[PDB]
Amino acid sequence: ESNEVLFGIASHFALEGAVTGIEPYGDGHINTTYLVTTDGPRYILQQMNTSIFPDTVNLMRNVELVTSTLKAQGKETLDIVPTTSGATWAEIDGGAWRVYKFIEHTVSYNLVPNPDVFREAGSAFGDFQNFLSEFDASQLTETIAHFHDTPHRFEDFKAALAADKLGRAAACQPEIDFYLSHADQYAVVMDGLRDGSIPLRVTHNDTKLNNILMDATTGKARAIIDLDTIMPGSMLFDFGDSIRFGASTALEDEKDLSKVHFSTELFRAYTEGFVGELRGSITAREAELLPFSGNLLTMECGMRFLADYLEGDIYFATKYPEHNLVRTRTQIKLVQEMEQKASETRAIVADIMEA
Numbered sequence: 001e002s003n004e005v006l007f008g009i010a011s012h013f014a015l016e017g018a019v020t021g022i023e024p025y026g027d028g029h030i031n032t033t034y035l036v037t038t039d040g041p042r043y044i045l046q047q048m049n050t051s052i053f054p055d056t057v058n059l060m061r062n063v064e065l066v067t068s069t070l071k072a073q074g075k076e077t078l079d080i081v082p083t084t085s086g087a088t089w090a091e092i093d094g095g096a097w098r099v100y101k102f103i104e105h106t107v108s109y110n111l112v113p114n115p116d117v118f119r120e121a122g123s124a125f126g127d128f129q130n131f132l133s134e135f136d137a138s139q140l141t142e143t144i145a146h147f148h149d150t151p152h153r154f155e156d157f158k159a160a161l162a163a164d165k166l167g168r169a170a171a172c173q174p175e176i177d178f179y180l181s182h183a184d185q186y187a188v189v190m191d192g193l194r195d196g197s198i199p200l201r202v203t204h205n206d207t208k209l210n211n212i213l214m215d216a217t218t219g220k221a222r223a224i225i226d227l228d229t230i231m232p233g234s235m236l237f238d239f240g241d242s243i244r245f246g247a248s249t250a251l252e253d254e255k256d257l258s259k260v261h262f263s264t265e266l267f268r269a270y271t272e273g274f275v276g277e278l279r280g281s282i283t284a285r286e287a288e289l290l291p292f293s294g295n296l297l298t299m300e301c302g303m304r305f306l307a308d309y310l311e312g313d314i315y316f317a318t319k320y321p322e323h324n325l326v327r328t329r330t331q332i333k334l335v336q337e338m339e340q341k342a343s344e345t346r347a348i349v350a351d352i353m354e355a
């Protein structure tokens with residue numbers, strides 16, 4: 001996006017300083033995000049991806065409900081900066097744009113640097129789930145259908161595979177066959193939700209580590225910062241996805257696979273934090289599935305990366321042609337180690353399930 005256009009977008013919002021610069025920012029794969037520097041405060045400017053979130057009204061209604069409820073409890077959250085006409089987002093030339101106050105005095109991580117950071121992440125996400133349980137499922141309409149319905153994701157994967165639109169399949173048979181051969185594992189959570197053996201809860205659904213800001217002084221979680229996929233789900237979606245991103249010893253798109261490991265110690269630290277908040281609500285079935293929810297969300301996200309690769313990278317932002325193939329391979333490597341360490345993680349959860 002050109003500067004002139006971006007600065008044009010910025011003039012629609014009630015900013016409280018003269019804009020000095022607007023630059024791409026952060027690692028979100030879906031929305032396009034910019035840091036707005038002014039002669040005063042800073043702001044996050046985002047373009048909402050309307051092919052992924054077609055219902056902008058419903059999405060902004062959810063974000064607005066979640067944020068306003070958090071504000072009404074004196075909890076720090078994302079602060080929508082309204083347009084100059086007081087709307088919570090602006091439609092400009094076929095684009096959908098919103099502005100958040102920049103969250104000051106924070107750090108965030110793409111890679112956990114020690115167990116204490118990750119424990120705090122589990123504590124923050126566990127507590128977020130407590131907060132979300134105050135809502136009826138009916139107040140928070142799904143903003144994307146079948147979002148962690150892994151069998152439905154596998155259907156998309158299969159169709160992308162059979163289409164093989166770019167002829168990319170030939171160079172990634174091992175990765176493809178990994179997802180094919182695990183097909184029998186995908187329905188466990190959806191089946192549990194459908195038959196009542198796993199409770200339906202309002203969940204965050206994108207709980208990767210870089211969606212929590214930590215205070216730069218105290219190290220405590222300050223705010224959860226990507227509220228877009230809050231909707232009904234399983235607690236296991238939030239748990240498994242955190243483990244997926246944050247129990248790795250390497251970046252999601254690490255090119256050197258020898259650096260990619262699943263850390264049981266990181267698994268333990270997140271679990272202590274997370275289960276420590278949710279001890280009084282976690283059911284026996286949920287506890288039983290905690291380790292495998294890691295496998296499941298890693299496989300779901302990995303298959304999505306691979307599907308996108310095969311489709312010519314139409315869903316996730318990428319920085320080079322193979323980026324999605326590189327991403328899928330870290331996910332596969334992590335699942336391989338999670339399988340191998342399954343009894344260790346079962347023991348870790350059992351241990352912790354004794355507060």
Ligand SMILES: CC(=O)N[C@H]1[C@@H](OP(=O)(O)O)O[C@H](CO)[C@@H](O)[C@@H]1O
Nearest residue numbers: 027028029030031206208226229301
């Ligand atoms: C709406 C959507 O598809 N969000 C994706 C997307 O999250 P972002 O926070 O938008 O980068 O990338 C994640 C993988 O890094 C994936 O886990 C998640 O489901």
